[PDB]
Write a protein that binds this ligand. Structure first.
Ligand SMILES: CC(=O)N[C@@H]1[C@@H](O)[C@H](O)[C@@H](CO)O[C@H]1O
Ligand SMILES: *[C@@H]1O[C@H](CO)[C@@H](O)[C@H](O)[C@H]1NC(C)=O
Ligand SMILES: *[C@@H]1O[C@H](CO)[C@@H](O)[C@H](O)[C@H]1NC(C)=O
Ligand SMILES: [Cl-]
Ligand SMILES: [Cl-]
Ligand SMILES: [Cl-]
Ligand SMILES: [Cl-]
Ligand SMILES: [Cl-]
Ligand SMILES: [Cl-]
Ligand SMILES: [Cl-]
Ligand code: NA
Ligand code: NA
Lengths: 132, 148, 151, 132, 152, 133
């Protein structure tokens, strides 16, 4: 078909004799052949633009400061992981028992062992290392 | 034939009238026969008078985790006022949880529409962290086709 | 053309068949071609046989604050029975619990139905009574409609 | 020009019979001239009562039955009469605030009497004035 | 005319493509004009190109008492793709209420106008957020795909 | 009409000159006259087949071992009633005050009685009979 010669970034305009028109503003086509162009992804509110929409590729979003992406293709934002928690693929979960995270946006390290021949001056929690 | 479908431009939840993609090179969008879109007043303009099946679709997506609740409404308004002082009206409740991150609405009916009848859609939101929810793009749709 | 739309008269939630406004001077109401309404049996009567898109809409409104829950159903029944207890189209809407500002409830369903000459369509409303005085049908919003698809 | 523009409120412009002005059918009304149809009369049933009857030219207004009172614009819903500790506001029967009380049903919150400024001894609650 | 309606065969909630009753002797089922069903690929095949109103209905029923929650989705996919990749022409999610006072069903309806080419194949993928996939099931004779031609 | 002579188990085939075709596989018609056959009820997952679908009658379902029917026409299954409970039409409800059920899938009997002239060694519970002294 003549539509199979319209390159990515145009559509095959059925309204004007199967000609290759440019994609209209805020739209794109990633493959050749298409009878229409898909709408450009919008990045607003909590979203921000990581990659601009082009005639040939959709825009990619990231999150504003204070938040981080979640899901495939940054489907939603989530507030930065607090003191006791840690960032996983499926959200900020609590640190597991025997581990702690002291800072915000941090990663859980295992409690220090007081095996070292010392006494537990202060117990270990989800937020705080053991004290010796 | 005699039909049209429009896709809402809006993503954020702001009280006010919806803007619409009206170019038929866009996917999900059609305008055929005596049907046209006023970009300025944000209105769908019907040329020939008749009975139409008119529908609209509304989809929401949670965009901030563990946050956002409340209610969102669409309201179709005719101009000139065909009868008194909302021809079609749809409310979708935003869930408060374990993974309900979306919310769907569909409504349809037969409407008698006059020559030059202008159709516009007002979005209303019961604001409860209206930054935590957004319109799902390419999914808030107004459509109609002629039955007569 | 060949279509009709009817608006339910009923406001209270009572188990039993719905009455319908059928006069085309009313807003939201149409009857055209071979379609008519039996006021006595509360039935929509189809004159010409064919395939129709038939839809109904159901909207509820909370009318007593902080009260009322449960479930409400519509059921379209054909006559003559085009089997036993055949429900050609059926819609249930759940009433949210008595909460933060959930005072309405919507339902829409549609499908293509084959309808015979003289086919009578009526709608039975069923309610899971849980303070059925606290909820009511939203007026001008419980609608039965159809238009002919077969040319 | 437009013959429908001469049909007065309380009729519709009957497109079915050569644009003539028919009376609105029973249980309907039209508040403006020009209309092609009449709107259904508001029904007032169950908890609702009729404050104003539907006319051919105006919609019916509802009020609430005894024991209940209106709420929302146009009396959209009824609410049970405010109890002992509470008071009627636009958005429902809320509790009396701190420092105030309401003793009767369907009442209004007055501020607690002061025992210390009056030179005597005292405790006030949401339902009851202060035990001077 | 130019229309079709299909009723899903599937009762269990299994991720994958839906099978469809396509015989017009069945109640709720119609195929007319240039419309046909490939039994092997589970696809509805459109002969003449045009603008169609396409809808699908989804109904679920709780089948084990006090059990089952989560989410269930339908997704219509065209072939060949009118556009891009992973294009979902029509998409419906229904939330399953939590395991409660007498919420044993769940309804979904969605419709829109779609432009469909000659030979366009429509298939439906069912996705389930399994919380309990044994507690809930498709209500039989109620998960329906339909369309009729709008273009004269 | 000619359709009024098509017996239960066929449909009146409007597509081929009002003739009586057999119902297609996995369908049935319980009356004569029908223009279509209704789909056979499926019994899968928790469900099992009590009665097979025929051309003239729909299939009936029952529940798998561990579960029992509930509602009209076995609309849902429910896990077998536990120790303290008893099977009613509207589900496994608790035994009432004064009564107990000791076994699973059991029925509530009333507590044994002061009227027999003995002492209460152990008290009565929803699960357990009274233990007289
Ligand atoms: C002596 C003794 O164990 N008595 C218990 C006690 O909890 C209660 O007084 C009685 C009557 O309810 O049931 C039994
Ligand atoms: C720490 O917790 C352990 C039990 O895990 C307990 O034996 C000990 O007394 C605690 N020490 C302090 C200092 O609280
Ligand atoms: C009244 O309440 C105040 C605190 O609000 C306290 O000083 C006092 O105990 C109470 N007086 C009496 C008489 O109970
Ligand atoms: Cl926006
Ligand atoms: Cl009534
Ligand atoms: Cl017939
Ligand atoms: Cl299956
Ligand atoms: Cl049918
Ligand atoms: Cl199109
Ligand atoms: Cl698929
Ligand atoms: Na009337
Ligand atoms: Na057979």
């Amino acid at each position: 078909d003549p539509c199979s010669n319209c390159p990515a970034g145009t559509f095959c305009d059925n309204n004007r004799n199967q000609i290759c028109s440019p994609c209209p503003p805020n739209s794109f086509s990633s493959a050749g052949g298409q009878r229409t162009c898909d709408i450009c992804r919008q990045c607003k509110g909590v979203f921000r633009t990581r990659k601009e929409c082009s005639s040939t590729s959709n825009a990619e979003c990231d999150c504003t400061p204070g938040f981080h992406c979640l899901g495939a293709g940054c489907s939603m934002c989530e507030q930065d992981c607090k003191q006791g928690q840690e960032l996983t693929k499926k959200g900020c979960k609590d640190c597991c028992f025997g581990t702690f995270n002291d800072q915000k946006r941090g990663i859980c390290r295992p409690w220090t062992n007081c095996l070292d021949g010392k006494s537990v001056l202060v117990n270990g929690t989800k937020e705080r290392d053991v004290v010796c | 034939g005699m039909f049209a479908q429009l896709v809402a431009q809006n993503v954020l939840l702001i009280d006010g009238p919806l803007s619409w993609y009206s170019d038929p090179g866009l996917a999900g969008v059609s305008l055929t026969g005596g049907l046209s879109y006023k970009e300025d007043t944000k209105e769908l303009v019907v040329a020939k008078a008749g009975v139409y099946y008119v529908f609209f679709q509304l989809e929401l997506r949670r965009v901030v985790a563990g946050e956002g609740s409340g209610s969102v409404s669409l309201a179709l308004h005719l101009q000139p006022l065909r009868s008194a002082a909302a021809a079609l009206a749809l409310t979708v409740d935003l869930p408060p949880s374990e993974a309900r991150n979306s919310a769907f609405g569909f409504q349809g009916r037969l409407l008698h529409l006059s020559a030059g009848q202008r159709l516009g859609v007002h979005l209303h939101t019961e604001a409860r962290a209206r930054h935590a929810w957004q319109l799902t793009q390419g999914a808030t749709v107004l459509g109609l086709f002629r039955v007569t």
